[PDB]
Amino acid sequence: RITTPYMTKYERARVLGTRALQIAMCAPVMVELEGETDPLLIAMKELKARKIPIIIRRYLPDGSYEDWGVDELIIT
Amino acid sequence: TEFFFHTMAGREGLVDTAVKTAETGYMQRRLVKSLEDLCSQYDLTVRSSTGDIIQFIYGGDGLDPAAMEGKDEPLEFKRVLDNIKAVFPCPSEPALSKNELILTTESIMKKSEFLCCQDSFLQEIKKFIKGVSEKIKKTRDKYGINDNGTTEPRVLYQLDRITPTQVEKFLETCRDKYMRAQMEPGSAVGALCAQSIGE
Amino acid sequence: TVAVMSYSGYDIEDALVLNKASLDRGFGRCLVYKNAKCTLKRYTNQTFDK
Amino acid sequence: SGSMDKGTLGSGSKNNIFYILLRDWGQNEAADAMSRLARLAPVYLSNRGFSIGIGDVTPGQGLLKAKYELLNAGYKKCDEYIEALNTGKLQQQPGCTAE
Amino acid sequence: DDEEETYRLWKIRKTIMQLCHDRGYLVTQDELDQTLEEFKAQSGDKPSEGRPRRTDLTVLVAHNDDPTDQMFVFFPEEPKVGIKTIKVYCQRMQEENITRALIVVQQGMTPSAKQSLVDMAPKYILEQFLQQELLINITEHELVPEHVVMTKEEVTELLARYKLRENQLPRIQAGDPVARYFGIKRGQVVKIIRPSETAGRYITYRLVQ
Amino acid sequence: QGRFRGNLSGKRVDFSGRTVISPDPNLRIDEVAVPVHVAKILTFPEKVNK
Amino acid sequence: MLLFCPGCGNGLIVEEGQRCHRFACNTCPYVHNITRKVTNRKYPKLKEVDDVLGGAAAWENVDSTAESCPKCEHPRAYFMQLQTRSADEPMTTFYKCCNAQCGHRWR
Amino acid sequence: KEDLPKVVVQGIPEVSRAVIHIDEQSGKEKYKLLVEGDNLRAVMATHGVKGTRTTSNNTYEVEKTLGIEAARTTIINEIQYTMVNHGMSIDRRHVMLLSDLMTYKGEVLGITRFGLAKMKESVLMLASFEKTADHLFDAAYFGQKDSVC
Ligand SMILES: [Zn+2]
Ligand SMILES: [Zn+2]
């Protein structure tokens, strides 16, 4: 809860990549895509809709960690 | 003779650039090989690969150099204030005096979302607010503008016109820009520094 | 017949715009000749490449 | 007011209109504005016409007269300095020799 | 001579007083703000002034920690201090029961005397200072920031706030001029306040190692 | 040309091309034109999904 | 100075005999006693420069006068032109304007 | 006669040339000393010189005389001045990070192979940068395990 509440661009890129890799492997879609043959477009639509089932696990350098949901974080 | 001298100067420039390219390539290689280990952590402390801390905070404050709007400054308060006044002109709200501006600034700054912000940026905001309030006071003293809002020439209120809505918009925009202009954790700051020094 | 002017913004940095009819009527037509060499040599034994 | 130039549309430094758009309304609006500019400026530049000729670099009569006068004055002053240094004492500037 | 030598002596005395005030020893305001006229009143000539004895100081005590703790300062008259002078100073400190001593050399220290002073005794701490370095105060320099030695509680709070260890803090050599000026040992931490371009300040920390 | 600098830090890869550039203002800043010939050579592995 | 023996031509050194200082050679018994004073001056070069510099009149040894700068538009200026880069197709400018103690320095 | 005129009678032996620079500010024209020497302590120790406002270009002398933080500040100022001399500007955070990396072990360590070996610990990077065989054989002798951090 001490880190920045904004979702950085690196986290955005990694979440989008993981979601695209999952959707490419026959993962269920939660945004009811309309003629999107590109998995990255579906991942971006899910990110804009805030429906990505991925929780970022931010690790502190000492060893502590904290979980943040995509819908909980702030996107730009 | 003049053509020969011009060709001499051109060849001097060419060989100078030829040596400069190689020298800067070697320097850039060394700088990147030395600085590629640093990275910005989540606790706002730049640490090396072995875990040793190089800086407790990047640049002393923690702002992104790529998102630096001013000359080594996060925001240009004058331009932001002008943009806020231009984008959101409220014609149905009266102008603010010096005391009212200071009061509303102190009332808005003491909210919860402004607590997590750095103290230096808040002090700069207070200084800019005091300066613009002094400017408004000087204008109203030069043109005899009364703070009660009953002056017959209303065009006098158009010299330095400010409304609490514009004040809130300016403060929120400055806070959002200062929050989004901070160093994002995980960025390879060392490589960026090496490249921005070598280029 | 070159005309020094800006046209369609396809000659921004050192580029040039060519005329289709000029290239169609033989302007700039070039020929590239390449060589392909092969050798049929006889070895130590009484045999040859055929 | 004002006319666009490198100080406002170029990649020189801050205060660029595209930079203001990027910092105020996001990346997409700035990209769209740059695309519209890159699609508009060539069309108008071709429809108006912009050319350079030998007559755009030729000097005028007054310019030639001024150049001749300046060359004469400079050569006279250089000859005076040469004569002062070679024969006599020349005022030596601080931090350097007479030559 | 007799004009620049007394000025150097007065400036060295003022620098030593400032160093003792920064380290926490007991010094009155008169000793800190000592004009050249008062030094001339004490001694205005070089032969009248006594480097080995008239310049020594014994009233330096750590009033903040313990008044019983005493620190001594020596001003050897010879340019190069030998083994015999170091032994005489050590036996004088033994007689007077003093553990902390400074030695303001005039030109330098011989390598044998340096090696002996290094391993004199763990209880007898002696620090060598060249007068050429003491002619200017390092703290008053514009490039040198403000350094404050933090106590064990502050070090513990720093390690707890960032969840760090001792070896993870930035290092600073014991032979650093500021380190010898403050007389910090291995394991102590110093907070440094760098003046930024704006009205704010940058707080950093360094461990002596 | 050693192993570290020639084969570890920097190494050659496939699925890449090299071609001369030419200006085209009718495209966006985030878009780049690719020839048809190179596009038929550089392939992308897409996984069959629903 | 450098003296040589008339006999063999080798260099003469100065030593002390039984009566007075004398020049002598190391390869022959030739000697020469010193009668009167002998001197050899060298007249080393003295420091003639006062090492005073930086005058405003001497500093303003430049062409730039009564121009317009995009910083403070003061007349007195100081321009410098550089052409030592082939990668940069245009040239390079450096303008300074310290008429009202501004001290600008840009590209 | 070969070395009698070449003996020093007054001044610092390390100092080779000192000139009187003047600033012609509209308020007042002030005088300063520009010394082409490699001894800052001696210059600060001389009478009449305000040592509190004395700087230098050699980072090693500043480090040895006024501490590691003064050396870091000198490095930052010198890099910024050298960059401004060419008309190009760099954000101060980059040079601050560079100086902090060069001055985080208490000693100014260069970007050369010596400073890079003294700062870093990874064997693979030291081998890849310079002195491959020497570093590899030294690591094989020491048996130092290298992590993947
Ligand atoms: Zn002879
Ligand atoms: Zn001007």
DSSP H16-33: --EEEEEEE-SS-EEEEE
Give the list of residues 6+ apart from residue F49 with CB closer than 8 angstroms, or none.
A23, A24, A25, A26, A27, A39
Q: How far apart are CA A19 and CA A53, in angstroms?
A: 9
* Chain H: residue whose CA lies nearest to E169: H104
Give the list of residues 6+ apart from residue B114 with CB closer than 8 angstroms, or none.
B108, B122, B175
Residues of G in contact with D11 (CB under 8 A): none
Interchain CB contact of F4 with H (< 8 Å): yes
Q: Please answer whether residues A58 and A68 qualify as being in contact, where contact means their C-beta atoms are separated by less than 8 angstroms.
A: yes
Give the list of residues 6+ apart from residue B145 with CB closer than 8 angstroms, or none.
B139, B151, B156, B157, B159
Any binding-site annotation on G97?
no
Cβ burial, residue H127 (10 Å; 0-12/13-18/19+): buried
Amino acid at D20: I
Task: Look at the block and give the residue holding tokens 């071609």.
Answer: F19
Does H contact C via 3+ CB–CB distances below 8 Å? Answer: no
Please write down the HEC assignment for all residues of C1-50. Answer: CCCCCCCCCCCCCCCCCCCHHHHHCCCCCCCCCCCCCCCCCECCCCCECC
Per-position DSSP letters for H75-137, written without gaps between them: HHHHHHHHHHHTT----HHHHHHHHHHHTSSSS---SSHHHHHHH---HHHHHHHS-HHHHHH
Question: Helices B77-87 and B164-180: crossing angle, nearest 10°?
Answer: 130
Q: How far apart are CA H105 and CA H63, in angstroms?
A: 12
Bridge partners, residue E128, by sequence: E103
SS3 content of chain E, % helix, strand, coil (to 5): 35, 25, 40
- Ligand 2 centroid distance, CA of G73 (Å): 3
User: Cα dihedral sign for B127, B132, B135, B136?
Assistant: negative
Interchain CB contact of D55 with C (< 8 Å): no
Q: How far apart are CA E74 and CA E53, in angstroms?
A: 8
Chains that touch D (3 or more CB pairs under 8 A): B, C, F, G
**Feature table: binding site of H for DNA:** 113, 131
Give the list of residues 6+ apart from residue G105 with CB closer than 8 angstroms, or none.
G94, G96, H84, H87
CA-only gyration radius of chain C, Å: 25
Phi, psi dihedral angles at G39 (to 5 degrees): -135, 155
Rounded to 5 degrees, what angle do the CA atoms C21, C24, C29 make? 130
Q: How far apart are the first and last CA of chain C?
A: 56
CA proximity to B125, closest of B182, B74, B184, B62? B74
CA proximity to H63, closest of H36, H102, H94, H93? H102
* CA distances for H134 relative to E51, F7, F9, H142, angstroms: 55, 20, 19, 12
Residue H4, CB half-sphere, CA atoms under 13 Å: how many? 3
Alpha carbon B186 to its chain centroid, in Å, reads 22
Maximum CA pair distance of chain B? 80
DSSP state of B54: E
Q: How far apart are CA E198 and CA E170, in angstroms?
A: 25
Across the interface, whether the CB atoms of H26 and G101 are under 8 A apart is answered yes
DSSP H or E stretch at residue A58: strand A55-59
Cβ burial, residue E197 (10 Å; 0-12/13-18/19+): exposed
Task: Look at the block and give the residue holding tokens 């010189």.
Answer: H49
DSSP H or E stretch at residue A47: helix A39-49
* Ligand closest to CA G70: 2
Does A contact F via 3+ CB–CB distances below 8 Å? Answer: yes
* Chain B: residue whose CA lies nearest to E169: B53
Give the list of residues 6+ apart from residue G74 with CB closer than 8 angstroms, or none.
G97, G99, G100, G102
DSSP H or E stretch at residue E191: strand E189-195
Cβ burial, residue D3 (10 Å; 0-12/13-18/19+): exposed
Phi, psi dihedral angles at D85 (to 5 degrees): -75, -45
Query: What resolution (Å)?
Result: 3.4
The residues spanned by each domain of chain E are 1-136, 137-209
Residues of D in contact with C7 (CB under 8 A): 46
Q: How far apart are CA E113 and CA C35, in angstroms?
A: 86
Chains that touch H (3 or more CB pairs under 8 A): B, E, F, G
Task: Look at the block and give the residue holding tokens 């070069």.
Answer: G45
- List the structure tokens of E61: 């005590």
**Feature table: binding site of F:** 5, 12, 18
Across the interface, whether the CB atoms of H106 and E142 are under 8 A apart is answered no
CA dihedral A8, A9, A13, A15 (to 10 degrees): 20
Q: Please answer whether residues E56 and E104 qualify as being in contact, where contact means their C-beta atoms are separated by less than 8 angstroms.
A: no
Q: How far apart are CA E79 and CA E26, in angstroms?
A: 30
Q: Please answer whether residues A33 and A45 qualify as being in contact, where contact means their C-beta atoms are separated by less than 8 angstroms.
A: yes
Residues of D in contact with F23 (CB under 8 A): none
| Residue H88 burial (CB count, 10 A) | 9
Nearest C-alpha of chain H: how many angstroms from E91?
32
Helix (H, G, I), strand (E, B) or coil at F13: coil
* CA distances for H71 relative to B138, E185, H65, angstroms: 47, 21, 9
Q: How far apart are CA B106 and CA G56, in angstroms?
A: 51
For chain H positions 36-95, those within 8 Å of chain E (CB to CB) are 41-42, 44-45, 47, 51-55, 62, 64-70, 73-74, 92
Nearest C-alpha of chain F: how many angstroms from C35?
25
CB neighbour burial string for A8-42, b if at least 16 within 10 angstroms, e if fewer: beebbeebbeebbebbbeebeeebebeeeeebeeb
| Residue A60 burial (CB count, 10 A) | 16
CA proximity to F30, closest of D21, D38, B65? D38
Q: Please answer whether residues H149 and H124 qualify as being in contact, where contact means their C-beta atoms are separated by less than 8 angstroms.
A: no
Residues of E in contact with H44 (CB under 8 A): 135-136
Phi, psi dihedral angles at E147 (to 5 degrees): -115, 135
Q: Please answer whether residues G23 and G12 qualify as being in contact, where contact means their C-beta atoms are separated by less than 8 angstroms.
A: yes
Taking each continuous run of H as one helix and of E as one strand, the counts in chain E are 8, 10
- List the structure tokens of E190: 């110093």
CA proximity to E76, closest of E46, E105, E114, E108? E105
Please write down the HEC assignment for all residues of B124-184. Answer: HHHHHHHHHHHHHHHHHHHCCCCCCCCCCCHHHHHCCCCCHHHHHHHHHHHHHHHHHCECC
Rounded to 5 degrees, what angle do the CA atoms E91, E93, E96 make? 110
DSSP H or E stretch at residue B15: helix B2-35
Rounded to 5 degrees, what angle do the CA atoms H140, H142, H144 make? 80
Does C contact D via 3+ CB–CB distances below 8 Å? Answer: yes
CB neighbour burial string for E110-142, b if at least 16 within 10 angstroms, e if fewer: eeebeebbeebeeeebbebbbbbbbbbbbbebe
Amino acid at E180: R
Question: Helices B119-142 and B98-109: crossing angle, nearest 10°?
Answer: 160
- Ligand 1 centroid distance, CA of G2 (Å): 13
Amino acid at G41: R
Residues of B in contact with D29 (CB under 8 A): none
CA proximity to H117, closest of H129, H100, H108, H106? H129
Nearest by CB to B120, which of E162, E167, E200? E200
Q: How far apart are CA G82 and CA G87, in angstroms?
A: 13
Provide the residue count of chain D.
99
CB neighbour burial string for D28-61, b if at least 16 within 10 angstroms, e if fewer: eebbeebbeebeeebeeeeeeeeeeeeeeeeeee
Residues of A in contact with F50 (CB under 8 A): 26
Phi, psi dihedral angles at D74 (to 5 degrees): -65, -40
Q: How far apart are CA A11 and CA E29, in angstroms?
A: 59
Q: How far apart are CA A40 and CA A34, in angstroms?
A: 14
The CATH code of domain G56-106 reads: 2.20.25.10
Q: Please answer whether residues E138 and E144 qualify as being in contact, where contact means their C-beta atoms are separated by less than 8 angstroms.
A: yes
Cβ burial, residue E1 (10 Å; 0-12/13-18/19+): exposed
Spatial strand order of the sheet with E171-172 comes to E146-150, E189-195, E201-208, E171-172
Phi, psi dihedral angles at D98 (to 5 degrees): -70, -40
Question: Helices H92-102 and B2-35: crossing angle, nearest 10°?
Answer: 60
Q: How far apart are CA F25 and CA D34, in angstroms?
A: 10
Cβ burial, residue H20 (10 Å; 0-12/13-18/19+): middle
DSSP state of F15: S
Q: Are strands E125-130 and E100-105 parallel, antiparallel or unpaired?
A: parallel
Any binding-site annotation on G20?
no
Per-position DSSP letters for chain G, written without gaps between them: ---B-TTT-PBPEEEE-SSSEEEE-SSS--EEE--S-------PPP-----B---HHHH--SS--S---TTT--S--EEEEE---SSSSS-EEEEE--TTS------
- List the structure tokens of C50: 């055929």
CA-only gyration radius of chain D, Å: 27
Rounded to 5 degrees, what angle do the CA atoms B169, B172, B178 make? 135
- Ligand 2 centroid distance, CA of G105 (Å): 11
- Ligand 2 centroid distance, CA of B142 (Å): 30
Task: Look at the block and give the residue holding tokens 């030109």.
Answer: E107
Q: How far apart are CA H64 and CA H61, in angstroms?
A: 5
Per-position DSSP letters for B73-138, written without gaps between them: SS--HHHHHHHHHHHS--TTS----HHHHHHHHHHHHTSSTTTSS-HHHHHHHHHHHHHHHHHHHH
Alpha carbon C9 to its chain centroid, in Å, reads 27
What approach was used to elucidate this structure? Answer: cryo-EM
CA proximity to B44, closest of B20, B62, B63, B32? B62
Helix (H, G, I), strand (E, B) or coil at F50: coil
Task: Look at the block and give the residue holding tokens 């090989």.
Answer: B33
Helix (H, G, I), strand (E, B) or coil at B40: strand
Across the interface, whether the CB atoms of E168 and B57 are under 8 A apart is answered no
Interchain CB contact of C8 with D (< 8 Å): yes
DSSP state of F9: I
Task: Look at the block and give the residue holding tokens 């696990």.
Answer: A57
Cβ burial, residue E191 (10 Å; 0-12/13-18/19+): middle
Q: How far apart are CA G83 and CA B14, in angstroms?
A: 10
CA proximity to E141, closest of F19, G52, D67, H53? H53
CA proximity to A56, closest of B47, B185, B181, H148? B185
Task: Look at the block and give the residue holding tokens 């009332």.
Answer: B107
The residues spanned by each domain of chain A are 1-76
Across the interface, whether the CB atoms of C4 and D52 are under 8 A apart is answered yes
Does C contact B via 3+ CB–CB distances below 8 Å? Answer: no
Taking each continuous run of H as one helix and of E as one strand, the counts in chain F are 2, 0
Cβ burial, residue H44 (10 Å; 0-12/13-18/19+): buried
Q: How far apart are CA B118 and CA E199, in angstroms?
A: 13
* Ligand closest to CA G32: 1
E183: phi > 0 → left, psi -120 to 50 → alpha, else beta; which? left
Q: How far apart are CA G21 and CA G11, in angstroms?
A: 16
Interchain CB contact of F33 with C (< 8 Å): no
Amino acid at H76: I
E86-95 CB contacts, 8 Å cutoff, 24+ apart: E86/E113, E86/E116, E86/E117, E86/E120, E89/E126, E90/E120, E90/E121, E90/E124, E90/E126, E93/E124, E94/E124
- List the structure tokens of H117: 């070996």
Phi, psi dihedral angles at G52 (to 5 degrees): -105, 130
CA proximity to B197, closest of D51, D27, H83, D98? H83
Interchain CB contact of D24 with B (< 8 Å): yes
Alpha carbon B152 to its chain centroid, in Å, reads 40
Phi, psi dihedral angles at B63 (to 5 degrees): -110, 150
